[PDB]
Amino acid sequence: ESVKEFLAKAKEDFLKKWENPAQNTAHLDQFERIKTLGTGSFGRVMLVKHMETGNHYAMKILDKQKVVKLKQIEHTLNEKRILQAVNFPFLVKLEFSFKDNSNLYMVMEYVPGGEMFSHLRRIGRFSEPHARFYAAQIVLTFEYLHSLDLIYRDLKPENLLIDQQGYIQVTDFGFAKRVKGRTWTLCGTPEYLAPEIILSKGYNKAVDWWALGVLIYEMAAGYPPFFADQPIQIYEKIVSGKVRFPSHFSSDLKDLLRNLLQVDLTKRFGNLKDGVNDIKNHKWFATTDWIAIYQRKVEAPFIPKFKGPGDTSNFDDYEEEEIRVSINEKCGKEFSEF
């Protein structure tokens, strides 16, 4: 098989970068800061312009002291180390990373179309074919990532950027990890967490396939299969054994979903002896041309409106905030490898 051969080459390519990561490939002063696209408890993501090229990037800025307070050091090193090493059309491209006294920076190629989350919430729900177009891309991406021993662990529409050709780029690798065995960290997003994570068992890449079922459900339904006002109530739902489908869900869609949202690991699609092929060969996917999807030759259900290079209207507005860089190095030994 050519898929295997693809994936073997992919792996050589990745391991070379994994084992010898790029470090320190730009400096903050090389970029003009334009606008905040998002904020979080340890950093923010801004639109910037690289002066030397005039290219636009999304620069993620992480406050090292906040990373340390939140016990996210290893996770942050995972994120940069994996991102600099992967290469797949549906993955955001990390063009540069560096650090200074205060902060870590990861500069990704700018995806102006915004997150799937925005377009899904506004439009309400996607048609089955529209959902399937997106789901195919996640299927290929996870097959790629998992072959490299990587677990992604934060699948949700919020992390799926829509590019100028209407294709996805996955962003936000802060919980991705290269692991051959099982792993135990409780992380992810409530609605997307597999039962074995909630129940504190060791788990593996099957959690990504359970999250795929959550995603497809949410894309085709317009709401997730398990929701409540509080996370504890969401967890009781997830572990309960019970999912209801809208009556508009095709019977094939419902059957994929029952196999993806399977509480039982020896039964979960993507986790069986035939692996990802159980999913790619499922009937819900019978019209999908996997190679044309990879090649981006399929016409997209939707192309975001682009007013021009540097537009941010597909992102929400955020209070701006100075970037102050300390005169003293913070946490140097913690982030030495970044």
Added chain:
Amino acid sequence: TTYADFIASGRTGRRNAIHD
């Protein structure tokens, strides 16, 4: 409807990761 119960819930905006 489930759609109405969703839209009226406190989880229709961007959802935060958890950890720990």
